[PDB]
Design a protein around this ligand. Sequence first.
Ligand SMILES: NC(=O)c1ccc[n+]([C@@H]2O[C@H](COP(=O)([O-])OP(=O)(O)OC[C@H]3O[C@@H](n4cnc5c(N)ncnc54)[C@H](O)[C@@H]3O)[C@@H](O)[C@H]2O)c1
Ligand SMILES: NC(=O)c1ccc[n+]([C@@H]2O[C@H](COP(=O)([O-])OP(=O)(O)OC[C@H]3O[C@@H](n4cnc5c(N)ncnc54)[C@H](O)[C@@H]3O)[C@@H](O)[C@H]2O)c1
Ligand SMILES: NC(=O)c1ccc[n+]([C@@H]2O[C@H](COP(=O)([O-])OP(=O)(O)OC[C@H]3O[C@@H](n4cnc5c(N)ncnc54)[C@H](O)[C@@H]3O)[C@@H](O)[C@H]2O)c1
Ligand SMILES: NC(=O)c1ccc[n+]([C@@H]2O[C@H](COP(=O)([O-])OP(=O)(O)OC[C@H]3O[C@@H](n4cnc5c(N)ncnc54)[C@H](O)[C@@H]3O)[C@@H](O)[C@H]2O)c1
Lengths: 261, 261, 261, 261
Amino acid sequence: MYKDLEGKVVVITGSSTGLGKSMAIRFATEKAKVVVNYRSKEDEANSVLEEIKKVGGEAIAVKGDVTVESDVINLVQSAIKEFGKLDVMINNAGLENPVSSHEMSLSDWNKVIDTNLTGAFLGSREAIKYFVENDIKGTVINMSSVHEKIPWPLFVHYAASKGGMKLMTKTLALEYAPKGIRVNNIGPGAINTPINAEKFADPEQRADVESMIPMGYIGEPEEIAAVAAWLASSEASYVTGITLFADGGMTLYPSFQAGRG
Amino acid sequence: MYKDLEGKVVVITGSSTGLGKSMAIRFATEKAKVVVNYRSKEDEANSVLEEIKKVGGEAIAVKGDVTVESDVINLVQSAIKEFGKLDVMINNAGLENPVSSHEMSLSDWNKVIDTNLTGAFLGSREAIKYFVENDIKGTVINMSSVHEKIPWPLFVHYAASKGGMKLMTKTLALEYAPKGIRVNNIGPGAINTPINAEKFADPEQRADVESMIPMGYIGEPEEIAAVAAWLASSEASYVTGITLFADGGMTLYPSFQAGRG
Amino acid sequence: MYKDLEGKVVVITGSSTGLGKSMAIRFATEKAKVVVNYRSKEDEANSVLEEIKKVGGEAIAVKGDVTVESDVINLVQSAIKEFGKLDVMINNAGLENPVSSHEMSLSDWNKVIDTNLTGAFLGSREAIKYFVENDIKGTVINMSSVHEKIPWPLFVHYAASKGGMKLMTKTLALEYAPKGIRVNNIGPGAINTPINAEKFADPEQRADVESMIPMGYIGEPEEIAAVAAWLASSEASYVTGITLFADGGMTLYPSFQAGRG
Amino acid sequence: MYKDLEGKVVVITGSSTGLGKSMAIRFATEKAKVVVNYRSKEDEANSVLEEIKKVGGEAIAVKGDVTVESDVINLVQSAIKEFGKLDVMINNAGLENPVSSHEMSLSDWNKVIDTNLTGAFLGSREAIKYFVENDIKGTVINMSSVHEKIPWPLFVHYAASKGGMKLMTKTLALEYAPKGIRVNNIGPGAINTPINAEKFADPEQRADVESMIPMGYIGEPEEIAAVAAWLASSEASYVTGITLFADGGMTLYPSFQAGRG
Ligand SMILES: NC(=O)c1ccc[n+]([C@@H]2O[C@H](COP(=O)([O-])OP(=O)(O)OC[C@H]3O[C@@H](n4cnc5c(N)ncnc54)[C@H](O)[C@@H]3O)[C@@H](O)[C@H]2O)c1
Ligand SMILES: NC(=O)c1ccc[n+]([C@@H]2O[C@H](COP(=O)([O-])OP(=O)(O)OC[C@H]3O[C@@H](n4cnc5c(N)ncnc54)[C@H](O)[C@@H]3O)[C@@H](O)[C@H]2O)c1
Ligand SMILES: NC(=O)c1ccc[n+]([C@@H]2O[C@H](COP(=O)([O-])OP(=O)(O)OC[C@H]3O[C@@H](n4cnc5c(N)ncnc54)[C@H](O)[C@@H]3O)[C@@H](O)[C@H]2O)c1
Ligand SMILES: NC(=O)c1ccc[n+]([C@@H]2O[C@H](COP(=O)([O-])OP(=O)(O)OC[C@H]3O[C@@H](n4cnc5c(N)ncnc54)[C@H](O)[C@@H]3O)[C@@H](O)[C@H]2O)c1
């Protein structure tokens, strides 16, 4: 679909599952040279790699924890070592867990902030460092959430991490725009993934979330991979520092449908 | 580029020049059927129509003033009469003129609000009316501007029209998302078009504008038509109620570059 | 409470009822010289004036339709004629009516846009014109709504009017900030007023709206008058171009409480 | 000025200097009981404490590093132990340092995120924990910045910390609004404080900053403490989850003045 993506090197953190996996497969289909990432489970990457082989794509799997500076540095270097360059950096790794704010431990708060936000900073910093030092107009895509805008009770750490990612991305975008380096966020709504498999398999919980989505359905990973592929391409040549929400309308305030209030 | 766009009927207001023209050609290239629009004489639309023919596209030009209800209604009916249906409605017609707010006439204010906002309303209304009465999962793309967010002294009417268009679009998107009818805005930054041809002709004014664009260059119409094609496609299937900015970073506050403030 | 408001001339459009009335009474209590406004019913102003007399305040009632340029011009002049000056201009007049967007007539759309948005522009233009021509650091407060941000199905015209008012205010604020003229919006959530009396008297409808308000209760006009009084005072000396939401949390997405989604 | 503030217990982090100091004095003037905070030595807090004594206010100074959980907990307990309760918790402590993003160390990034965001979290958490376990309708005011919205090259960590603070606050406000616990942010623009004393000392840098402020002048701490007093008062009873900007117009995009672009 996107011809300019051919031969482009794409690194995606936490890409052995969910959205990250869907993005690695989509990029492989666009003839991009993908670098899949797994925290510790090298077995999880096997599946994505097989899917990538199935479409005649090229990719390697690199172990790396986004909260570990050396792992992030090594992840970017691995891409350059294997493919000779880096074009797109996608900070997709993330985690969440429901706890009432006044009962949330520092440990829980720090883990989410560290992975979701600090992890994205490290990945962004490394990709941009390479782009600057070698005069490459590469791009950085950060996997945010509708929650960088929609507050999230029980998930204050996640909301904060994403709200912070928003400003980080915008700052990075304004800072490196003169060098032609684009930095954007993708803001997914509810998307059928492993972290949601059990919750959404239950008709009661599935219907509840669906009632919060104006378009009436829970998105598929393909719908988000489509956003990333487009944002990375030259089609989005004049697009930077934005958050492209792919959420079925969640950010439109579903409680206000039918003229309520 | 987008296979799903083939055979789709796209109506674009004020598409004889600038962004509208570019989108009309881009949709022609996507093998879609296009209904171009001109305000006064059909001579104005022949350039676009010849461009569409050149790429093997199918199209017609229909006269219409977007502030005239019957004209807007006729425009939608003409598409349906000529191509049998309607899939994408793009409210692109617009106008602006600088005047200090406290000295701005009601006449000037009204001309801008009527065309930019009310005009967009009528077009969205007619297209959505058709989509609902026929349960068609159509889409409405409204051409906004960075000024639906960035205030604009001397263009208080333009800014308010786009700010109003933002809420109109969000409302329409929430109201019709249950029917799969997506409504999105595109927010262009400074784009080289006939309305800027003279201003950007003076290298001193072009340089002033470029200094407000983080990416350092005034955009080209193709960079916007790229956004319109994607938004209309099924690639943006889960995207509704958003404003996708393509401004090379304008909304990022250019005056705060290099840690200023 | 606010000492600098003593002797300040405050004009409030549509102040014979609801929030406007509460603001006129509050300003009178702050020893401000208030100019109440009624569209045609001079009898409605009687009540506000009596309430103003009850607190030992000073005020006059002026007839004026905000969609009529001459009425607006005359309203501002009346303040200067009676009290010798103008310090604060509050564009509070407004209207709404529920109609599905694809079924909304141009007449309905125009009436709401004309009163809510164009009416605010005229009032803002006149107040600012006076402020500029006489070197006065006066202020303009525009009565917006949570709907300048929250989409509103069935009320597309209202949402659009308020979204437009947001950009108008911001533009006016940036434009006249060099002259020390502040322009801000107040964004009320659900507030017990005449337009809501019948709807909220019904326990079922009252409970529905209350379920959309995080703080659990429908606000009182006094809670909004408190916002206006503060914004007009020198306490808000460094505040301009903002929208101060007084909504019990509506803009925080009530559908997302308890970690839903 | 605000009668309801008399006898209220206000805790303010990093209140020995700047904005924190000003708010502490302002709350003293409002006849409230204040708990001032200093990081290293109590010598630093004596200026504030003497200022509070001067106006007849009651107060104590409590040592505490906001990134140390036990210190934050002790700070809340000390207020409750000294004045019997807690009514207002103000997370003011903050820090920043310029470094190009791609060259920013994890250490620098962490120091800023930990103090600005995590520190604010701990304070909000402890205050809210107390408010919930005692069903007290307390309030939390978090000191953000225009940079929770305005991107800031060279301060990617600061910007992300405030962006994260915005979502944290919104989440906390939605989560606890049912209990009448209001949580709001204050977004100061450029304010003359010790962190800017040296930079604004050079008339060339002061002029550069002033040129980015629509209102033309760098704010004073009192202009911010004014906002804090109001937000804490019952005058803002229906205000929660907002960020009240006091920046003389910075968020209005100063580069777009006079119709530029
Ligand atoms: N699934 C959704 O509906 C949804 C909605 C909005 C945003 N998101 C965001 O999209 C991204 C993808 O989410 P997902 O649904 O696929 O979730 P996921 O949990 O399936 O994917 C996240 C991946 O990150 C990996 N990971 C976590 N911590 C890591 C670390 N320290 N180092 C390396 N890898 C690490 C995990 O092992 C996992 O495979 C996340 O950032 C998430 O917050 C998802
Ligand atoms: N050019 C830019 O840099 C830029 C930046 C942001 C937004 N926009 C927006 O994009 C759209 C396209 O702008 P453009 O640059 O091509 O401007 P344009 O003026 O060249 O295009 C608008 C077209 O609308 C037509 N038109 C105006 N009023 C009309 C009416 N009442 N009925 C019918 N046709 C009418 C005009 O004749 C014109 O051809 C507009 O909505 C504009 O506000 C443009
Ligand atoms: N009541 C709420 O809950 C709420 C919430 C958000 C925003 N608002 C806004 O606050 C303002 C006050 O609303 P309210 O609840 O008091 O409603 P209201 O209808 O009681 O007050 C509006 C007043 O405007 C007057 N008016 C209408 N059109 C006019 C015109 N053309 N010329 C002169 N006067 C005119 C009306 O006669 C009326 O007294 C409105 O702008 C409204 O949109 C109200
Ligand atoms: N000064 C401005 O122009 C301005 C503009 C926007 C926002 N702000 C914000 O307002 C707040 C006040 O800023 P300020 O200008 O007075 O800055 P400041 O640095 O003078 O005040 C912050 C105080 O926090 C203390 N502090 C820092 N880290 C701490 C820690 N870990 N534990 C305890 N105390 C700690 C510092 O010693 C200092 O006295 C900050 O949150 C700042 O980011 C200030």
